[PDB]
Nucleic acid binder design. Structure first.
Lengths: 175, 36, 426, 175, 175, 160, 36, 36
DNA sequence: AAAC
DNA sequence: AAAC
DNA sequence: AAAC
DNA sequence: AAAC
């Protein structure tokens, strides 16, 4: 058969280890790692989730140099919780005029088309978002966020976000 | 004996239109009368 | 026994197809025909030049140069060849240079690498001679490798890097151009007559620097001439130059309606008029595909070097006609120019040249063959084309950056017996 | 209806039995079978997983003869663990200038769009990867890797990887 | 909305009841019903699976009259085990110069893109296979195979296989 | 063939003399066509060559002397372009005076040269020999296929 | 002073072919010799 | 010595039709007789 | 090198 | 090498 | 079989 | 009904 050459999520050639080791979920959802600019793939083979009622997320900084209001932000993630937190997952958009360390008070959410199985969660989806600052001095951030009434537990996995400001070529043997 | 080749018939292909030769002759079918 | 001592010269059809592919600024051999002393050679190359599919519609034509050179073997084996011809039948067989074990590691010579890994030294050496006499910048050092196995995989597979089309930055004065010249004077007198002389010598220097780095040029300067045998240079028999073009393909599905792909198909024809081969040698035919050096960040010199002095802005002919070459940096003409990278320009050059303008909206936009960041490196690295500067221009394919399908019609009027004179004992 | 003639993963005509019988998961994730060059389909009807905290993977050697930096690597897998390891799955890219037997210290990860159900795991996805050595002497390897805090257990299944350096024809009855 | 007119699996207009009532899984995976030639849909509302360590499968005979080496073989199946066998599913290719009753010693496997949920299993996928005999006198067979360390149990369901040697028309109201 | 031995004498031989089918007519042609441009998101920049060639085979009137069949056959072929053929002089070692000089007295007078598949091919079997006319390499030129095309599907080239 | 407008150049667009004017003059580059 | 360039052969590309030169000469292959 |  |  |  |  012919090869499928279209994807909803193109992960970055290089991935990064989460240098953190525990997160305590909260309304002021902590940002797992200092944000990178256009695409980043973060993996953690063991993260300790403290009992907490809020969420935690992994961010990318939108690149605002192409004046194109709506851009596609894609997410790729495979995560495994030791216990089943009964959590809801989503893409978050928030702005901050300074490197964020927690989710600001104002943010918007968007549903992904993932699949929940117990404490397992996998997604490959994209969403068009308004990527330029709604407010003149800020930086806009888009992330993958998990939210629940967390119980101490542990998780494993990778979360990849990509801002489609450019496409990616690959070989197409018939061209 | 064989010789010059010519399928070089410059043209876009045309759907086959009719399996009846170029020059015909006497009558071949007898069915009892006329049949369209 | 009596043998077939003669032969009568008759036309030999050495025609063949050529299925080619290369990178953007690299010189590659596309055809080679070994010639015998006394034959007459003629060729009609007619084919199509294609670029890999590009990411958006056509924006700029690329230029194509096809060259045919003649390289006598003497030129390559010297004394050894002379002796071989004289020795005749029992001459010691000719030396064979070494290649790297890969199928494409002799591709620059337009050939498949034999399993043994060696080729006739004349094939490798002829290429070097051609490169060193017409393609490197006069002031760069010659390519002096003993065997093809000393080359990187990109030089070996795609051919050597050529220079960009001339620019203010792409064609600066030679590296060692002097910006001053001292005359050792005495403490409280100068010799009016020595000074005069001082000027005569610098003149002679200056000319060799700017126009005569090559021996053959120094002689033309005297109004004499020098044969290709005098300095061993490959003889340029023919050269064709052209702009390749094509058409855009309109996408028509739900998502790609409003989108285009530029298709460059260029029919070309390279014709070498009859040529008398004076001594045994190879006839090399090479191709070079290049784009004008449009950088997305070049600035106009006057707009990027600070405050403007009278010398820079006024266009005063007495000034420009009389002061030393001006040393400038990559930063005076580029947005991310390395101020540490200098170059010598003619005073007033900025009034004799105009850079192309690329609006900043195009800066990292894929599908345009523009140079995205200013070349970083020594003068030599900046003038030699870097094929990767064009990677984001095309769809990724197995046939590199350009491919050609040609029919080499070649007729040689040689004098060797007939294929049967040859297989019949009597 | 018309037939779908496009696939994200074209498995190789021939599959191989895993000659190994137990793996003890680790940071230095053992390579299940000596790698083949462009595509390989490995199946094991019984593999014993020793308690281990790391992963194990199945590799292909990238073919680096077509100078095309980005190529598509597809994966096809159906695996069943006797118990539910609560593991995360991914594609791994690593280089090694010698036949690898364990995951080197440096490697990159990419998320797939699989589905986790207890101890069951199935995937059919492709990813574009930079397939030529980032370092001059190496060989690049791409694999399917499972990572968790493994408990002794057993698994069954097949894992198929393919480097799209060429396409595959099939009959198309209307052509 | 417009109607989707493309499918990965076109089941045959007629289905057949499995005349068998128990299978005892094995390495020499028993062939559930004598194979039909190009496409067959087998359904069983109750099959008794004897404890066994191997698999069982449902076959079609490849039609080798169109000299086209690679053809697409599609599978459609919905199966329910009373207990969760923790089994791996796949497409099998094997040849035999005589009607097969069990899987021969040599065969190849290919992953499908199904979904496992406990003892439930559903798939709709196609795979291109080399359909002409690799060995001159044989007949090639392609089947849907289940493999595990089976415990006595029972299963319900249908398994449909189709060799795309021809396409299927359907009405297209706008033509 | 017997019929050739006789022509050599300047005689002629009927088709009945050696029982050979009589060739009445032969047409030869090059088939061509055009490329189809793909235009969807993924196949824009991609083409498919469509070879439609109108041809015409005409056999002028022929008197049938005795009862028989009139057979009409077709043969479609591509020029034998291999992706790995090398130029003989470029692939057989060190060059001797006999191989490189083009000396007519030599070529006009020595036996056929026995060569191997390896002297003209990249993966040539050195054990597979063949007899060539001396100087043949100066009477012929192979086509060149850059190594970038080696296993590229879609070209009718002979790959090994 | 300005006047009649004319981009009404009836034609399909042509890819830019060459950044070198229409009428040239004296030599501008000196590199030590000939360079292709 | 080299000179005017001319691939400016105005035309749509044509598939390569035949690797045999323009002007041929004497016979090159001897196989024992005629071979089509 | 008063040369097939 | 747009050269006394 | 580009043949005394 | 390509017919004394």
């Amino acid at each position: 058969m012919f090869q499928t050459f279209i994807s909803r999520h193109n992960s970055n050639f290089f991935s990064d280890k989460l240098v953190l080791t525990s997160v305590t979920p909260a309304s002021s959802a902590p940002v797992l790692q200092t944000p990178k600019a256009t695409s980043s793939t973060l993996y953690f083979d063991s993260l300790t989730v403290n009992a907490g009622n809020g969420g935690f997320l992994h961010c990318i900084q939108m690149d605002t140099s192409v004046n194109a209001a709506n851009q596609v932000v894609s997410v790729g993630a495979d995560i495994a919780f030791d216990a089943d937190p009964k959590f809801f997952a989503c893409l978050v958009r928030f702005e901050s005029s300074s490197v964020p360390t927690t989710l600001p008070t104002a943010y918007d959410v968007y549903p992904l088309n993932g699949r929940h199985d117990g404490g397992y969660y996998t997604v490959k989806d994209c969403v068009t978002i308004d990527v330029l600052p709604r407010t003149p001095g800020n930086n806009v951030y888009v992330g993958f966020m998990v939210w629940s009434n967390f119980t101490a537990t542990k998780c494993r996995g990778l979360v990849s976000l990509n801002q489609v400001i450019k496409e990616i070529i690959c070989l197409q043997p018939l061209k | 004996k064989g010789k010059k080749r010519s399928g070089a018939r410059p043209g876009r292909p045309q759907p086959l239109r009719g399996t009846k030769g170029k020059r015909k002759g006497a009558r071949l079918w007898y069915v009892g009368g006329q049949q369209f | 026994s009596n043998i077939q001592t003669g032969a009568e010269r008759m036309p030999h059809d050495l025609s063949h197809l050529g299925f080619l592919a290369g990178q953007i600024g690299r010189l590659i051999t596309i055809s080679t025909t070994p010639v015998i002393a006394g034959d007459s050679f003629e060729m009609d190359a007619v084919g199509a030049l294609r670029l890999s599919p590009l990411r958006r519609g056509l924006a700029i034509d690329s230029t194509v140069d096809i060259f045919t050179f003649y390289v006598p073997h003497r030129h390559v084996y010297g004394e050894q060849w002379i002796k071989f011809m004289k020795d005749g039948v029992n001459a010691t067989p000719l030396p064979t240079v070494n290649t790297t074990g890969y199928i494409d590691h002799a591709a620059f010579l337009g050939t498949i690498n034999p399993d043994t890994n060696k080729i006739p030294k004349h094939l490798f050496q002829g290429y070097l001679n051609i490169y060193n006499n017409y393609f490197k910048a006069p002031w760069m050092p010659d390519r002096t490798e003993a065997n093809p196995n000393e080359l990187n995989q990109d030089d070996a597979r795609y051919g050597f890097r050529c220079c960009h089309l001339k620019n203010i930055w792409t064609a600066p004065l030679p590296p060692e151009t002097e910006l001053s010249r001292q005359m050792t004077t005495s403490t409280t007198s100068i010799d009016i007559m020595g000074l005069q002389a001082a000027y005569a010598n610098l003149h002679t220097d200056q000319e060799r620097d700017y126009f005569m780095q090559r021996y053959r040029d120094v002689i033309s300067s005297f109004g004499g001439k020098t044969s290709y045998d005098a300095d061993n240079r490959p003889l340029l028999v023919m050269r064709s130059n052209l702009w390749a073009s094509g058409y855009d393909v309109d996408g028509t599905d739900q998502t790609s309606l409003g989108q285009f792909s530029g298709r460059v198909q260029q029919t070309y024809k390279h014709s070498v008029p009859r040529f008398f081969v004076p001594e045994h040698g190879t006839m090399f035919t090479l191709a070079l595909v290049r784009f004008p050096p449009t950088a997305t960040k070049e600035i106009q010199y006057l707009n990027a070097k600070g405050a403007l002095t009278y010398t820079d802005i006024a266009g005063d002919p007495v000034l420009y006609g009389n002061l030393p070459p001006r040393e400038i940096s990559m930063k005076d003409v580029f947005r991310s120019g390395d101020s540490s990278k200098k170059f010598k320009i003619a005073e007033g050059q900025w009034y004799r040249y105009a850079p192309s303008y690329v609006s900043p909206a195009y800066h990292l936009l894929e599908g345009f063959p523009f140079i995205q960041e200013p070349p970083s490196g020594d003068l030599q690295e900046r003038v030699l084309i870097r094929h990767h500067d064009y990677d984001q221009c095309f769809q990724s394919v197995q046939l590199l950056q350009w491919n050609s399908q040609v029919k080499f019609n070649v007729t040689v009027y040689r004098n060797l017996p007939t294929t049967r004179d040859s297989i019949m004992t009597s």
